[PDB]
């Protein structure tokens, strides 16, 4: 499926997915690695910049991560990558067909555990060597010894002993010999998550019932136990600041803090990550610092801090509840409709089924922000009609943006799914605009466009009506009536003279806009789903229902090129910056590259995940695709 | 941040360090008894004479102050400044003075404690260093002129920001502004950790322990709207009242009844929490006057909740414990009181527990019902249990006399429960 | 007295002076190689120096009606208002209503 024109750059807008992030320490600073599917990332912990992404995609999903100081140990399907600066410097292949569930590092050893209850040991070939490379031996656990492996932990000060926690009980393996030096007793609950403690000889345990069990290894007994109502514990961490604190992360989105000295909870966080996507998959107090880092599966990563106590003399009793600090955000859901913001390819609007539009940044990946949804108080004085429990806007299916008059009034018009109006957005202030645009014939908004001057806002109703609202005041100026079925695309030319529209009745109507006269009217065969105008050359392309792209000259009022070759519905398409190409993506899981002079495809890309939108840059450099599965935006580098 | 923010942070850490003479004549001049001109002209040697002479009078009132003359009020403890000593030694000076202000706070109307703490004010700088335990020990004397003096010295902590308009004011801090203190969620977490520290030494006095609850009632009162605010409030208040029932003192236990009954009427607690609270009221209930208050809790606690399982039988460990501390004759003398409180929803849970557990004394179970006019659903919910008991128990003539009370009143109610379960002729055939 | 004993943890003999960090473990300048039982003893005491022992691990362990019955049930619940009941009695001052 190797293309000749495009090649993937990276996927924009993803932070986490559910795999537990693992932190590493450089000197006194901290870096967070996460993963995104088949390609992991690295975040600083002091300002959450993006520092390193991996050089190649892995052949499958990364299942587990860990990081010792410079070297990030990534574990996809059968193999374990030992990565430095995102560069694969040594690939370590495990000799089974089983998939690796969990991973651990201590000393000279690496400890990888496949899913069929088997643990592989990899030794440093030399103590000078930094990454362990040589296969030492294969440790197994039969099911009479313990259950399925929950995790691998190595506790503090144990010479080659490996605390293997299972769903039933807890083991210990001296990896130099290979022998089970100690087995624990069987637990009444299914264990879900284990974590060590900054005290000696204690690992913490987490069950499917809400019970945290402190467990000693020198005594082999349960020292303390903490019951939690109605929660499946998914993450554990201890604050190492000098104040005893346990952080229990549920799978119902709750994060719960305890004070083991006072035997009390302190403050419980509610819904810091979505319950449905997995809740708090991993939470970790950074070492010796009052910073806990929470990363759920809903494509976010947040840091919470403890302020110092307000009490002078008391201190450890009056504890400030935790506090929101910096975070990074992505779409939890796949993106429905995107666009580019400006000419230098510096921002991308992306609206998804999460109902929250985002202005991602191709340039610097810490610059991406959710556009706010906080309604302007009306000019008129009567109050705004809406539910008092604020819910997000319905998901966005059509967006239009002309960048010519930015910072002075609105320049983004979005049409929400199944709403008789269609809102506006300011680009510079990152906010919903003050005007909302109605259709005045009770039809749903299926297509919007803006004038190049940025003064007129087109709205194509699903009952033919093309209302043209002005963009200072949101006032109504003109209402065009040619179509009878749903209008599915409007445009205005570069000169603000002529205007086109396309309906599901097949009519492609050509308007004058200076005068209000209908210039002409063209009828094609099939209904017409979408339109992309190209204002530099007055060519526009249609997507029909007979699975062909028809390109029509806007001046001479006739079909110039017709493109056959697709085999299912054409999702979206876009012209090149110079009008020399059309790249269309369809439900045949292909992405083709049409060539307008010679009238044929010159490159056919079979992607397994179907591509919903394809948008060129206004600059001649980047190509952005959004697929059906996955959350982020695939960016293609242009070899042309 | 800026420069002057960081450079005023050094000023707080050296608030007591006398550097210039003018710095000393501002710090030493403030005190409890002497005015600002006559305070600056006297030695520590002068103040120690008046303190150690006064402290021996307090040792006569109670012998507990005799120990502090060995350590804090001793003659060798004039040369020691706080600032010279290490960090471990200062926390012991705090833990002596924190142990001192517990014993001092009770005898605070008396003149000798005013001359006693002043040397511990002026030599040991407690009006700067530890003014939480200075103010929390003396937070109940807000109307008095001695607390008005205590305000006229202290740089107030960040938690006591409600009183900050009453520092060096004419009139005393009024009663509502004391509530605005306790309305904060953080200032309560001191006054828990002050009280659980104060109970462990078993020196909690009557006027103090009133003013605790008389604020803790009002905090529930000012937050009776915001159901979110109350939801985060009872890890603070009920954990006191749990530890306030563990006290040996009968006077501390009655304070737990005032907070429990007030919070239970303001927020419908769960069934398991009320049964939890009813055990701890039962468990440490020894003296006479604590028992009367304790019975009006369970009288009132069972009426606060309402739902499915409202009138459930009491658990086994609960009931015999309630029979242990409350007598079945003493509960009858309780119902014959002409106060006659609403005992309505509890006794129909009490009577059913008799019917299942004990069963030896159903003479009482008649005489319970003559004394209280019950509710409509309660009598049906009782009579279902006795008809279950009628089949199971080895049949007894006093059980027949119980139904004769219900043949007297609400005859159709006896029929409709029998027409729900069993036969009409079979019950009269059974007896 | 521990619950387990590793036999080959005594036989192992580690040189201290190789790595830059472990040279703080030695007691005198003359020693260079320490067996595994004393090495893991010394490595615990440095692990004391990095993380001091808190109060809850050592002194405290979990191992008529009681007095702590009110504290325990407060620990085992997180939401205190009886919303689970479906009471069929209407709560005052707060009316759950949804406009259609």
């Amino acid at each position: 499926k190797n293309s000749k024109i495009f090649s993937p750059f990276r996927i924009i807008g993803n932070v986490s997915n559910g795999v537990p992030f693992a932190t590493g320490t450089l000197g006194s600073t901290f870096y967070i690695v996460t993963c995104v599917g088949k390609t992991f990332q690295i975040y600083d912990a002091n300002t959450l910049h993006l520092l390193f992404v991996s050089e190649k995609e892995t052949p499958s999903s990364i299942v587990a991560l860990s990081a010792h100081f410079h070297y990030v140990y990534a574990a996809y399907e059968n193999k374990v990558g030992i990565y430095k600066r995102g560069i694969e410097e040594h690939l370590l292949e495990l000799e089974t067909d089983a998939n690796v569930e969990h991973l651990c590092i201590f000393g000279d050893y690496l400890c990888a555990s496949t899913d069929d209850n088997s643990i592989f040991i990899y030794k440093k070939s030399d103590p000078q060597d930094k990454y362990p490379s040589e296969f030492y031996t294969k440790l197994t656990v039969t099911e009479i010894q313990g259950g399925e492996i929950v995790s691998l932990q190595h506790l503090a000060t144990y010479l080659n002993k490996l605390t293997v926690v299972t769903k039933s009980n807890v083991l210990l393996f001296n990896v130099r010999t290979g022998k089970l030096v100690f087995t624990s007793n069987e637990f009444p609950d299914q264990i879900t998550t284990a974590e060590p403690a900054p005290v000696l000889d204690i690992i913490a345990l987490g069950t499917v019932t809400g019970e945290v069990i402190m467990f000693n290894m020198r005594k082999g007994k349960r020292i303390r136990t903490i019951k939690i109502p109605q929660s499946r514990i998914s993450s554990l961490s201890f604050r190492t600041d000098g104040s005893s604190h346990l952080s229990v992360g549920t799978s119902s989105g709750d994060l719960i803090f305890y004070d083991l000295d006072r035997r009390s909870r302190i403050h419980v966080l509610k819904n810091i990550h979505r319950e449905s996507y997995g809740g708090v998959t991993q939470a970790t107090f950074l070492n010796g610092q009052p910073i806990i880092v929470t990363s759920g599966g809903d494509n976010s990563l947040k840091e919470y801090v403890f302020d110092p106590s307000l009490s002078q003399g008391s201190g450890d009793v009056v504890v400030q509840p935790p506090r929101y600090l910096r975070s990074r955000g992505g779409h939890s859901q796949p993106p429905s409709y995107i666009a580019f913001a400006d000419s230098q390819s510096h921002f991308m609007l992306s609206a998804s089924k999460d109902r929250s539009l985002w202005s991602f940044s191709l340039r610097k990946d810490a610059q991406s922000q959710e556009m706010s949804q906080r309604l302007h108080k009306k000019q008129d004085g009567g109050r705004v009609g809406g539910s008092t429990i604020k819910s997000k806007f319905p998901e966005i299916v059509a967006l239009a943006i002309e960048n010519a008059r930015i910072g002075e009034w609105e320049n983004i018009i979005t049409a929400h799914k199944d709403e008789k109006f269609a809102r506006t957005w300011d680009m510079r202030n990152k906010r919903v605009g003050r005007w909302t645009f109605d259709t005045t014939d009770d039809g749903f908004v299926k297509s919007v466009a803006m004038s190049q001057c940025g003064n007129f806002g087109f709205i194509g109703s699903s009952n033919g009506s093309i209302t043209i609202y002005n963009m200072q005041s949101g006032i109504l100026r003109k209402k065009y009536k040619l179509h009878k079925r749903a209008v599915t695309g409007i445009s205005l030319d570069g000169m603000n003279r002529k205007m086109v529209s396309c309906g599901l009745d097949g009519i492609v109507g050509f308007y004058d806009f200076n005068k209000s006269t209908l210039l002409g009217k063209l009828k094609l065969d099939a209904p017409i789903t979408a339109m992309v105008y190209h204002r530099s050359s007055d060519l526009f392309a249609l997507a029909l229902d007979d699975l062909s792209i028809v390109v029509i000259d806007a001046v001479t009022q006739r079909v110039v090129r017709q493109l056959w070759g697709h085999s299912n519905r054409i999702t979206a398409f876009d012209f090149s910056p110079e009008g020399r190409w059309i790249v269309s993506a369809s439900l045949d899981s292909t992405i083709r590259t049409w060539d307008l002079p010679t009238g044929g495809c010159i490159d056919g890309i079979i992607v397994d995940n179907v591509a919903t939108n394809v948008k060129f840059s206004p600059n001649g450099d980047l190509l952005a695709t959004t697929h059906v599965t996955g959350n982020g935006i695939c960016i293609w580098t242009n070899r042309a | 941040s800026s420069l002057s923010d960081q450079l005023a942070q050094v000023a707080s850490n050296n608030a007591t360090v006398a550097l210039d003479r003018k710095r000393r004549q501002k710090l030493h001049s403030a005190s409890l008894i002497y005015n600002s001109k006559t305070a600056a002209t006297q030695d520590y040697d002068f103040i120690f004479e008046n303190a150690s002479k006064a402290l021996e009078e307090l040792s006569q009132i109670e012998p507990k102050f005799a120990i502090f003359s060995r350590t804090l009020f001793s003659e060798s403890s004039i040369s020691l400044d706080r600032n010279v000593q290490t960090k471990e030694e200062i926390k012991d000076l705090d833990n002596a003075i924190n142990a001192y202000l517990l014993l001092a706070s009770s005898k605070w109307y008396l003149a000798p404690t005013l001359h006693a703490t002043e040397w511990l004010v002026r030599r040991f700088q407690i009006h700067v260093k530890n003014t939480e335990m200075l103010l929390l020990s003396t937070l109940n004397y807000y109307q008095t002129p001695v607390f008005k003096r205590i305000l006229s010295i202290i740089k107030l902590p960040p938690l006591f920001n409600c009183l900050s308009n009453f520092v060096r004011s004419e009139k005393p801090p009024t009663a509502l502004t004391m509530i605005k203190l306790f309305n904060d969620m953080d200032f309560l977490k001191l006054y828990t950790s002050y009280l659980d520290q104060c109970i462990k030494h078993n020196a909690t006095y009557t006027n103090q322990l009133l003013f605790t609850t008389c604020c803790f009632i009002n905090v529930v009162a000012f937050n009776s709207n915001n159901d979110e605010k109350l939801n985060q409030l009872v890890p603070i208040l009920l954990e006191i009242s749990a530890k306030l029932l563990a006290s040996k003192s009968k006077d501390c236990q009655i304070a737990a009844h005032t907070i429990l009954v007030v919070f239970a009427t303001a927020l419908p607690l769960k069934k398991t929490i009320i049964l939890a609270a009813m055990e701890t009221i039962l468990s440490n209930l020894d003296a006479k006057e604590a028992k009367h208050s304790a019975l009006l809790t369970i009288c009132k606690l069972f009426q606060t909740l309402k739902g499915q399982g409202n009138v459930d039988q009491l658990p086994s460990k609960i009931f015999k414990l309630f029979d242990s501390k409350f007598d079945t004759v003493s509960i009858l003398t309780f119902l014959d009181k002409e106060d006659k409180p609403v005992c309505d929803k509890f006794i129909t849970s009490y009577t059913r527990s008799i019917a299942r557990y004990d069963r030896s004394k159903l003479n009482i179970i008649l005489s319970l019902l003559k004394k209280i006019r019950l509710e409509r659903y309660e009598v049906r919910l009782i009579i279902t249990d006795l008809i279950y008991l009628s089949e199971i128990l080895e049949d007894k003539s006093q059980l027949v006399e119980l139904f004769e009370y219900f043949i007297s009143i609400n005859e159709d109610l006896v029929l409709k429960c029998l027409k729900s379960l069993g036969l009409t002729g079979x019950x009269x055939x059974x007896x | 007295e521990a619950a387990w004993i590793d036999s080959d943890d005594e036989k192992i003999k580690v040189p201290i002076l190789v790595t830059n960090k472990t040279k703080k473990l030695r007691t005198s300048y003359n020693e260079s190689k320490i067996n595994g039982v004393h090495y893991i003893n010394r490595l615990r005491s440095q692990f004391e120096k990095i993380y001091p022992r808190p109060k809850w691990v050592d002194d405290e362990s979990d191992s008529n009606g009681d007095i702590n019955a009110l504290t325990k049930i407060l620990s085992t619940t997180y939401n205190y208002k009886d919303t689970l009941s479906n009471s069929k009695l209407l709560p005052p001052k707060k009316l759950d209503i949804v406009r259609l």
């Binding site: 010792h68 010796g288 | 409600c162 | -």
Partner: peptide
């Protein structure tokens, strides 16, 4: 005035960890 709750600027102080990489000793 109520208790002035103001978040303070948080600097990461330095700390240290027990290295697990020293916990392995060679064969005898």
């Amino acid at each position: 005035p109520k208790v002035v709750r103001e978040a303070k600027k948080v600097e990461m102080t330095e700390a240290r960890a027990y290295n697990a990489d020293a916990d392995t000793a060679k064969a005898a």
